Amino acid sequence: MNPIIYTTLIMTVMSGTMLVMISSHWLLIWIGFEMNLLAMIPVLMKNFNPRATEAATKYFLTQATASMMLMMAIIINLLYSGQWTITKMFNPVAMTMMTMALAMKLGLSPFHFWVPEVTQGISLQAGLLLLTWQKLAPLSVLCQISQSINPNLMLTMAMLSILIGGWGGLNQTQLRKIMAYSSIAHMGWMTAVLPYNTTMTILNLLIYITMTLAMFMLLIHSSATTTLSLSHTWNKMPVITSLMMVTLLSMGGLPPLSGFMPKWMIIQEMTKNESIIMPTLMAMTALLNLYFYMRLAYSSSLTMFPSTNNMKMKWQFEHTKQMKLLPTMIVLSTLVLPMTPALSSLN
Amino acid sequence: MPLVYMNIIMAFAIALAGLLMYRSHLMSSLLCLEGMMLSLFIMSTLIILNTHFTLANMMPIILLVFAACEAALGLSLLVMVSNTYGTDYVQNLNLLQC
């Protein structure tokens, strides 16, 4: 892709997402999702390898299906109230209908089978876009309609996502699959609190976002695609594995490493809502994410692994990428636990 | 709510179910796709005309002109998956097992 073409392509993806967050009209919301899909596919189809074609086809089919399924829900709302604003919808069927359509585009419930595969086929750099920036617009809409959400449906979506997020990640070796399954588990964590408090959803959003680029772009700098390939990073770049391990520890949510901040506040907010079995279950199964987190952390920095003779060649040369925004992302995703009362800023 | 109003609604449901399960062909899958928007275009059209929403008549045509961006991108993906694998058969999309 010509850089000018690629830059404008990214630009409308951001514009498509941005339009969603700033549009009162329901129709404009569907437009923003439509533009986002319209330009997400070519970014995935940048490498032009069969896995990318597989992933783009899966992503398009599930996203387009949810897009027009979303459009159907709006029409029913129009059918029963004649409105177009995003305040609180007026038809219980439309509530579930759009909740299903919005949720599928996040890949949390059984509507998540695309997420592990779509990120697997496509390149790592485009994966960062898919699991970070394409996850704000549907969440933005959900926060706006959190008043009319159905708790029984929504929390069932949260439980399954965390359960599948941990269980799926335990059995994967391709670190791209690890990230997606971890992302799904994180998505269930944030998605559980919308009926209770949208502000805690936002905080879970930024912390999860910064964490993903921290992990993904560190993976970019190491230039690794499997756990075995990540193992050799200790020999060439010992430093990279050192911060990469502390990011994994934070990703589990062990204090004082920030990343425990969302889980902590999420538990506290639901506890105020007399929901106390629910926080315990997700918190208990949150340890499942830690197991493959430690497993990845184990064979990257904690224990050195058999390197290769040709690895001596890599030592002589140096990285050319300027790894922009990598350093402050690590610190902002590993030490900001003492600065938790910034929750008021989001409100 | 008149009989016809949900004659489109089920038509959308049948179109949704047809897209929600693939038989053997990606083109046939795509056919249910813009079939769903056809009912979606149709269903919106009765609402706006019946309610005399004099300014919402915008929405149908742009509902079609934007569903086309899906369709145009839709087959253009299939032409890619049907020139490497040769066949539009969707069971050949399992190459991403691992």
Partner: peptide
Amino acid sequence: WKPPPWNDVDV
């Protein structure tokens, strides 16, 4: 099952 290829390439 087989591990994926390393470069992801499969008139």
